[model samples]
Target chain A: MKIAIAGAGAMGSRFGLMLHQSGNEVLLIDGWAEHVQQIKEHGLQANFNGKEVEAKLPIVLQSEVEKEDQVDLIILFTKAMQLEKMLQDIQSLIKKDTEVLCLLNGIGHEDIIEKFVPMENIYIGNTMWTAGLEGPGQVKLFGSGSVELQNLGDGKEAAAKKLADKLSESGLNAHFSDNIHYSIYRKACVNGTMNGLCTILDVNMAELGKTSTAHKMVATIVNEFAKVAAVEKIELDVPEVIAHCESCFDPETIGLHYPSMYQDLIKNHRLTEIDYINGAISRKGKKYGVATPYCDFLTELVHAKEDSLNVK
Target chain B: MKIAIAGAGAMGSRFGLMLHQSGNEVLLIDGWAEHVQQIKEHGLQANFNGKEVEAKLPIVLQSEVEKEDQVDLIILFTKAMQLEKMLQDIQSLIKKDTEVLCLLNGIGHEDIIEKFVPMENIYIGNTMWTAGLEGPGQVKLFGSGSVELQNLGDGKEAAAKKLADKLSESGLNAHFSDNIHYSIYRKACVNGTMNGLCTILDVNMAELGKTSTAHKMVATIVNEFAKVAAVEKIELDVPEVIAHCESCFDPETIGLHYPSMYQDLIKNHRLTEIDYINGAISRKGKKYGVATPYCDFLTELVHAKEDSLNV
Candidate 1:
């Protein structure tokens, strides 16, 4: 199977390596010239379980994509906001039979992808793990992770089973979920509330759980987010989510780790998923007549902070 | 009547000269030792209506207040948050007959003063213009300024008439206001919305007026403040307040001057009257169940910006 991992920043590279090592013809596609050049000059480097690893694969920049090359399976790992533009740029390479799996972490990503591609080809997934690129061709994996996804594209039982089997065989611990949108939306809520606050407070994951004041603040924010989600008719276990957040705040659990928002701020780059995360919650909450004061306040706070950092 | 301008800075010093020239016994009281010493050594220097002006007056530091000296009128011109501590420090000097007039902007200031003194001894006023001390004993008066005040203290009506008569004689344009709180609240809303935004946008008065986006944003904030005021049963002319704001944004008016908030931020001062202005609006809006998202958002933004500046 000819599988293409488009926009292989961190997660894309990890999945690319896994598919490549599984004896499948995997293409690491990205727009970053230096990364593609480094991969071509050297090889794909994967750091798993605190070890340096390498994988040799066909790493292609945008220049390398030809119109004649038909891609059977395309797994999207781009930032949620970047998905549409990337799809439009690479639309010519995707055939009608292509099975597209999205592993992005924001709400409504599947809907965005479905806008560009057919519904039968859309596969939505949510991951509970964290990974990122230390540099071009170097992928860093941290902690344990799992994936829950649904084959929303095809809506066929066999199509769902086939993708789940392939993902599991590729060592992703993928499971077929009947409600992947709910899972994605839930994770989006978590990221929106936690990541933005963590960034504003200028703390790591463990620090969030450590400070009593910060912990309470985060709880208020998450509860407000639950209210926002409820306004949208999305059922969530508020207590369970709060418990999970508290655990992540623990030093022993997600300690001393900077989340993606901090990383983006550090790099002086715009955060891609904020619009879908806090922005979405704020927008939808307004529609549902939900008084999401904390979320609304927080959404504006993050945007202003982001604006200050951007220097525009 | 012997009147003391305690915590006298720019506005305080200006009032000192105006009242002193009107033949009222005006003494400038402040904690800034250098400024006190400068005024004591050089007299109170004020720039009123675009001319250098000076007045001879007795200036003293806070520690020098005498027990037997019964001050008839005291104009408390300190920042709102600082007023509490200033009052605490001078509590020993306050006599039962003393009438205190607070000429600061924003709401709940009278309440704060009443906590320190008897309600009958309190008066509240709002200023239409701003001034700043360039240095010790040097005051820079800007724009056309006037004051409206009402007596909330014992026999406030008589006390207010007397005070206004004294002030008007000095050409200070002091007028008695029956609803001084509403006037102060409106002024506070203007300060809360305009000053912080001007600071954030890094523009002075006139430039801010020209920016349509800025005007719209300020209008949104003031409108929210009006709703909160309405819930509290304060009948404020939201449109008039907005029109006044539009005037500030007008290029022909306050276009070139940076707001006090802007000045405070640039000076790297840890303190601002934000608590008195935006902070009050945020708290009051919550109590009244008024949705003041714009006000709350701006307040938080300035707060975080303050935090960042300090860091």
Candidate 2:
């Protein structure tokens, strides 16, 4: 299978490497020039499970995608704000039978993805995977993570399962989910809590979890997310999602890690996907006549923080 | 006339020295022992305009006030959060005839002052005078400012005028106001805009003013404050208050200076009077069923910034 990983930053690089190692031709596509140049020159430098390894893969800038570079699968890993541009840039390579799997960690992404590709060719899901970007073309990967995916349109189960099997063969622990929207919402609860709170508080998960106020804050956000999810007819288990979030705070797991949004907004001095995560929730809450004060405040504060840094 | 400047940090010390220079027996009372001791030893060190001057004023800790000390006027300059405690500690000196002139920069202070002194003996107002605390006993006083005060209760007009006359005699430029509540609300609009926004944005008044969003942000907060003030029958002129705030951003005036709240919360690493300023407005807005989302968020963000610094 010929697979392309778009917006190949941290997690994208990890998946690209693994898929390439599993006897599949993988192409790493990104918008960052330095990262692309470094990968093309030095291969993809990765620290997998504390062991340094390099994968030689074909990588290109988004502008370089051409008609001759068609792939059977295109994994969309762009930030929510960058999704539309990535879709438009990579349109030349998305063939008639090509399936684009969106593994981004936010809601309302499917609406945009559906506008780029046919609904039957869109695969929507999420990953519990975590990866850290040390620098351009450098990533630190650890621990075990799984992918849960489902097709957005009809009669695409076999194709979806085949992609999942191929991913499982590459040690990604991929599985076909009966309802991937539940998985997306559950993962969003984690991102919505950890990402915004950690960035605003300037703390990692472990430090945040130790605070007495963390649980209550997490609960307030989760309950709000659940209320909005209910309006969308997505049944979300508040306790289950919260418990999963709390578990990520364990020191042995991802407790010491700063979530991607924190890294983007604070560390890398880049814009965040806040508008797609908590901002999306707040907008939806407004649409449904639900008061999501916590999300609304968090969204505003995040934007304020960004403005303080003078990031246009 | 005998005067006592309670909670004498910077402003109180300035008033104390000026009053003493005018032949009024003034004593500086404060909670900080270091400031009190420094004043008692080296006198109140001040840079009046461009020239340095020292006024040998008697200074004492609040705990040092006794029955032997009787004050005809007590000028309150404490931070809003410290007002209640200062009133409690200085009760021995607040004689039946002693009037309290509260120039604190927030609303709802009269309720607390009335508890310690008779409502008739309480004077409510604000000052435009600016003073900076350089150190324990040292201060930087520049630019001329004035005071506008009013009696909180009936039959106190003569006494209020007398106090104002004394303050004017000392070059403090004091005047009696017809409606002090309106003046307080007006001053609050300036503080509500400059203090919270500057501290949260970590910028000086000039820098904040440079942002294109400054006018709108200030307008949002001023409108919210006006709604709450209207509910209290204070009738605030939002446009006038906002214009005053915009003018303060002039670099020649106060634009270069960081507001006191910023110094307290960010620089000095101390808790702010946010609870008494915007926080107070938010609470009152809730009581009056007025929506003050900007004030509420700014208050919370200031606290969050404080917590981040472990203040």
Candidate 3:
């Protein structure tokens, strides 16, 4: 079985290395032409586990993916907004029994994925694994992380678990989850709390962590998400979720890190993923019996912040 | 009988000339020596009842008042906070037969008065009369008004009525009040709801009045005052108070006026009397077991505007 790494900007290339190093036949599909050309001509460049490393891997642009190429497993790692375009471009390669696992790590990527692929072939998961791209065909990769995924297919548990085994053998530390919807929600708690607050106040995680109002402010939003999740039948362990969120406030892990939305809205002067995160929480909240005033206001504040900076 | 007008500001000057023209022996005592000298030289200047006018009457600064100045009636016209200082200044001229009447609006001035002058001699009332000071010894005076007063003395009704008759004879349209405290609170509704809201919004009465959200905001705060007043057994007629406040929104009455708080906080760059208005409402509210969040929040927001302007 051949594994395909879709949207191979940086993280996709790192996963491509691990699976190929483990002797699995791996192919990478990316939209960036220079990256595919760079890898094809000069080989994929990476810092990898240690020193300046180098590898030659099979890579092609989305337009160049073979219509006859048999890629059994495809792992998604695009930016949250780019998922729809990626799905549209890769529709030719995605076929019956082609297990599609998405790990973009916010929420609602599955909604976009299920539309392009059959339910029996759709899967979703989250990764603690981290990667960064310095430039074209270059990647900075280190650390080890586990993956948790589940089958959205009606009766495809055996196939999903088999992919998990194949991925785990490649030093990916993969595990098939009994209830992946809860796992997806658990990861969303991290982004939903830290990302919005850091971007709104224009502070890093540790700076927010040091404030006396941090507990009440973060807890208020977390509680809103918990209630909405409860109404939606995705029960969030709020205390654990809050504690997990608070971990980022410590400088040891990612306390000094400016969340991606902060970088998107502030550093890059671009729009944020708030519409998929807090906006979605507030949008569907009224459909059920729950009221999400905190979420509602924060979303406005975030969009207002975008407007304040003249972000398009 | 001689009548002494204390704190001879614009409103006081209006009363001083009226009582003198009515043939009552009126003396004006003031803290402004320049105003006293200006009045002594050029006489008092005013836009009285329409045209430019002049009236010269007996007047003295607080430092110039003779202890032997014969006086039987003293009308208090000082601001609420300045009442204590005015009393100390006039203590020399006050006599055992001297009767005092207070018509300055709002609550608790009588509390300070009773501590200085005996309650029997202390009279508190509410007046709809309005006046303005243009410059030293100059006033802009118009409109007719009535005074409603009651004696603070337990059994001094005879003296109170006699003074009311003398004032009404001057065409002040004065009437004796059975309970003046209720009238004071009724006038308070005009200032309490309108002044604070207009000042915070930086709008005059009509501007704040014509706003779509004005009625609800005014109604919320008026309800807070009513609730606290109810607990204190003051029995304010809420609908009547709301109706009167609504009048200030129309262009005729006080609708165009930028309330005193707006003038003090915005134009003059001075601290507001909010500590005495909404602050007092929220304070007594919690003590009487009533919740006043709207008042509490509005109070904070008004003070916040003060700091933002560096006021």
Candidate 4:
């Protein structure tokens, strides 16, 4: 399979290296000049699970993309906010038969991805695969992870399964989902509650759980998400999602974790994906006429947190 | 007017001293043993606007109150949370004609006051008087302030005016109001937005205003308060209230102020009046079947902040 990694950051670069090593043609596409330039020069450098490794692979700056370039599949690993521009930057590579799979963390990526590719060729998924960029060209790809994806448009299940099988060849542990939207929203519940709340209150999931209001807060945010998800035609099992979120607070799982949104707003002093998480739900609630005061309120506080920090 | 300042903290002590100085029988009543013992020995020491002064007034610890002693009126200056307990401590002082004037900072004092005193004798009001306690029994009373009160229960308008007039004799700028509940709800809006937001965000009113979302947040919270207030039979002019709140952000106004809630939660590392502010609105919202999510959300965050700081 010929592929384009449209985000080419940490996760994108990892997927880029893995697929390229698996005998598939893969070109890294991204907007970060320093990151892309380093990868372009030294290949994609990595300390894979405590061992130093590098993969020489094709890379292109979004500014230097060749219009003549085309790929069979495009995997989106861009920030949810940057998904659209990433697509527009690499639109020349998206042929009619080209498949688009979004693994971005948040809600409403498919809505933006659909404008770049036909729904029939568009895919959305959730991945627990973890990667970290130590520097411009350096990434820490560790452990093992799996991905579940589904085709939103009909008549593509067989092709989707083939895509999953091909991805599994790269040891990605890919699977075709009969209900990817459900999984997507379920993943969103994790981010929406843990990520959003921890960032706002400046606590780790563990510390937040220590508070008596922790479970109540999670249930409140998850209920709002479920309501908005139902309006978006993705029904969430509210109690199941709440249980999933509660485990997040348990010290056994990701409790010590300061979610990506927390790291963005607190550590890096950068704007968060609040717009695509609870913020997206609030927007969709307005569109669907659902009363999402919690979402609306949380969205504003997150934005205010950004404004207070003057995050770029 | 013979009176008892039920919660004799700084504000209550100041009022107690002034009424006593005006030749009205006034006795300070409170719970803090050290503070009350200091007053009992030193007679409410103070630096009144930088002039060293002391008021030789009677003081009583609420736990030591004599039921045989009753006053013509009781001015409530307790923390909203402690209002109920303060009333219970001094219930023996209430007589049929005794008037209870609540000058507490936040809302819904009338409901509690009604349980101890007759509705016709309960007077709810707002005061802008500024006072500080430098030490036990030592108060810093400064600046002129006014009080506005109305009889929440019917048939006491004439007696209420006389209470106001008698308070004015003690140099307290007092006035009668036909719609004090409106003022109470309006005052609640100021605290609900400024005090509540500033405390939760750990910012001053000025810092909060500096954020671009300040006004929008104020509008959001005020809208919820207005919705709940409407159900409680108080109609708030939303736009007017929004404007009133927006001015609070102006550096020229109280913008430089860190509201009481902020001071309580941040500086003192103590619990805040969140229950009487946004929390009250959320409770009222549930009771009235109104949706006040912003208030509900703000209330939870404030509570969580308390839990976070172990406040």
List pairs with backbone clashes in candidate 2. none
lDDT of 3 by residue, B87-170 (tens): 777777777767788877767666667765677888877776888889889998888788888877679777678778888899
Model 2 agreement with the true structure over B1-311: per-residue lDDT tens digits: 78889878878878887888889999888888889899889998999886899988888898877754788988999878888988888888777888889888678888788888878888887788989999999999878899999887888888789878989999999999877888778888888889987887777888777765677778878888889989877788788989998997899988999999999988899988887888878889889898877787667666766766678
Across A1-312, the per-residue lDDT of candidate 3 in tens digits comes to: 688888887778878988998898888889888888999999888897767888888888876766547778889988877878877877777768788988776665666787777878878876778889999899999888888888876777887788789888888888888778776777777777788777755568887777544665667678878887786467888899889889899988899899988899889999889878877677667767676655664565566556545565
- The complex in candidate 2 yields a DockQ of 0.09
Better of 2 and 3 by DockQ: 2
lDDT of 2 at A108: 73
Score residue B102 of candidate 4 by CA lDDT. Answer: 84
Q: 1 or 2, which is superior by lDDT?
A: 2
Q: Scored by CA lDDT, what does every candidate get?
A: 0.73, 0.84, 0.78, 0.83
DockQ (model 4, Cα): 0.46
Ten-residue region with minimum lDDT total, candidate 2 chain A? A300-309
**What DockQ does each listed candidate score?**
0.10, 0.09, 0.06, 0.46
Per-candidate TM equals: 0.67, 0.68, 0.52, 0.84
- Candidate 2 local Cα displacement, residue B127, angstroms: 2.5
**Model 1: pairs clashing at backbone N, Cα or C within 3 Å:** A120-A153, B120-B153, B120-B154, B205-B255, B205-B257, B206-B254, B206-B255, B206-B256, B209-B249
Candidate 1 residue-wise lDDT, B182-251, digit = tens? 7766777679767877665555766555443455566777887788778766778888988877677666
Lowest summed lDDT window (length 10), candidate 4 chain B: B198-207
**Model 4 lDDT per residue over A1-312, tens place:** 889888887888778888887899998887889988898789889988778989888888876777546899998888777777777778888778899888865577767777778888988787878899899899999999998988877788998898899999998999998887887789888878888788878789888888877777789889888988886667899999999987877788778888888888889998888888887787777878888777777778888778778774
Q: Which model scores highest in lDDT?
A: 2
Sort candidate 1 into its docking category.
Answer: incorrect
